[PDB]
Amino acid sequence: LHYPVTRQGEQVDHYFGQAVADPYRWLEDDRSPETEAWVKAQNAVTQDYLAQIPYRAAIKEKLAASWNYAKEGAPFWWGRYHYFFKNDGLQNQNVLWRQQEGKPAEVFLDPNTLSPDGTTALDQLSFSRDGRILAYSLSLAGSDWREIHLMDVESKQPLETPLKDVKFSGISWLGNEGFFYSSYDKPDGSELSARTDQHKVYFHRLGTAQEDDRLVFGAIPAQHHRYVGATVTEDQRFLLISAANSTSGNRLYVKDLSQENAPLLTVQGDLDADVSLVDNKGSTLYLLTNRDAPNRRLVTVDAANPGPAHWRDLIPERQQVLTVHSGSGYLFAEYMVDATARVEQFDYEGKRVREVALPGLGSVSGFNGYWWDPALYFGFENYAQPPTLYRFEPKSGAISLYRASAAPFKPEDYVSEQRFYQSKDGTRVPLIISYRKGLKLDGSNPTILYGYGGFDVSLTPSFSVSVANWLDLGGVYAVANLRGGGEYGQAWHLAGTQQNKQNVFDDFIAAAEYLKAEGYTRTDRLAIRGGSNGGLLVGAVMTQRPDLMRVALPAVGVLDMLRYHTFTAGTGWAYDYGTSADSEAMFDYLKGYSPLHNVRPGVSYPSTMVTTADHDDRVVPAHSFKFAATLQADNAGPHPQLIRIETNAGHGAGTPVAKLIEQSADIYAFTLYEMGYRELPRQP
């Protein structure tokens, strides 16, 4: 195969006086004709390579057929209608239906009719208090930017002109007058790569132009923050404003709306802890926080004097990480037991009502609703169990099956076992391994090891049609709960941040070694995969241990650790990574593992397929571009170093089903082909 010619520029950067060359700096210009031509040439080479794989079409057809089944979400009531999402099978975007008593259900909002390719996705949905107006945000081509649209709920007629420049925003109504939302001023230069660091809260009053929206927070110097959010409590009495500069830690303010021109009181004035409002009962605020609680706790405080010195424990911290949901007048404490969910019901006085028995070991969704909801709904799933919906009557605690999955996958056909392997420093790290029953530990099973490792994100069991198919093809899927994650609280998270980041990579390498030693797989039958921070994980491991695996799959990864903070809102990740501008120590540490700066000429890298998207403004595609360019120039081995750039897609959220199916097919076909399979291991 012949890689497109990639020009090498003369750009040289300096860090504390130390020079570092960046020959592919020009690829950072997402709007230049030169960069666009390179993307087109790279995709052509990749598609040409994939075209030689005999079973790629079979994998795609297998995926599509198995994906083709009815899906339905939990219903939610508002106004005279009960709303619920549905997908009859292969619709690119889920459709919002509604139904009122005594009448048949009807389509209310179909995102598939909003674009030619299903690339416009529905994000936030927020009804006015009287339920007559709906404000919803849409994503175009998958980018983080948003537009908020207004619609008359009964007639379905569009109202006003959509609001623009919305990003990382919720939509919270003040009665029926209007709503609060967050926005960044349109940056000069490419909105897809330019830096944005001053998030502001605005209030849109119905019947006016966006230019007249009242600026609520974030304009004056004292309020400059990279991330801000505003929410009006269910009872309309309080306005909560959160403000942050990084993905961990935030300030929180509260304003009494029942009091004419009340002042903004400080719930937490520093960024040393995360704190969010779960709900409120009168002037009593219920806050979830990790302040002085690594595994988090639930506290209460009166809105009149909400400072941390006055917070009082309602649900004390335990050895397991806590998350709190509220609904039907109850608080639901969801605890993480080795990455699996457990639920306990509490009243607002903090008295335990009962433990809610779950269908098994996995992840749960739901348990969220309004104080008046007569019933709550929750979903359960894991790697071998498709989403199942249950109805829960809070007072009696009665649980009933609301909707069984219509998926063609039979849970009893798979094994999903949890093991705890030993990392380099001795730390025991969780690993959940899934596969079809009948597996032999002869070290020959094609295996995909997946990880993330960072930002306090916990990888709890989740069902994926793509994964189930990998298992049906005879593969093994293993997910490591690496440090940097939030599985075991703040201590687990911090052990993988800044100058401890290498621990995350050591944890992943040890997972690969465990899988080989136990006989699940072997070097030439192993592939590693990860996305975003997980893409960094794969890039770092493949540059440090190119001999460890046969295939590397870094998706939308942060790969240039020296300049990542110079794009969009990347600086918000400094809490986890640190920046090259922090100090010589941080600069050396970052340069020490930065995938882009650790690719070396003469090294034989594993078969690699770098994936990214042209509208990914979360993690600019330039990371992947420069990394792929470097691998193609430096790799000395016989394995292909390809890059697949998805068009009209972003970081991942809201990607239409058709694109998801194509991506998985390409990835699994490439993986098996690079492992030397002439035919599929199992009948598709």
Written overview of the protein:
Belongs to the peptidase S9A family. It holds the Pfam family Peptidase_S9_N. One of its GO terms (cellular component) is cytosol. Keywords: Hydrolase, Protease, Serine protease. This is prolyl oligopeptidase. With 684 residues, the protein is α+β, with helices and mostly antiparallel strands. It folds into two domains: 1-69 and 407-684, Rossmann fold, CATH 3.40.50; 70-406, Prolyl oligopeptidase, N-terminal domain (Methylamine Dehydrogenase, Chain H). Helix content is 17%, strand content 34%. The protein is built from ten helices and 39 strands. The strands form nine sheets. It has an eight-stranded mixed sheet with strand order 32-33-35-34-36-37-38-39, sandwiched between helices. Strands 3, 4, 5, 6 and 7 form a five-stranded antiparallel sheet that branches. A hairpin with a 2-residue loop joins strand 4 (76-78) and strand 5. Helix 2 (56-67) packs across helix 10. The two termini are 29 Å apart.
- At the fold tier of CATH, the topology name of the largest domain is Rossmann fold
Helix content: 10-25%
Strands, count: 39
Strand content: 25-35%
Strand order of the largest sheet: 32-33-35-34-36-37-38-39
The CATH H-level homologous superfamily of the largest domain: Alpha/Beta hydrolase fold, catalytic domain
Protein name: prolyl oligopeptidase
GO molecular function: oligopeptidase activity; serine-type endopeptidase activity
Enzyme class: hydrolase
Organism: Aeromonas caviae (Aeromonas punctata)
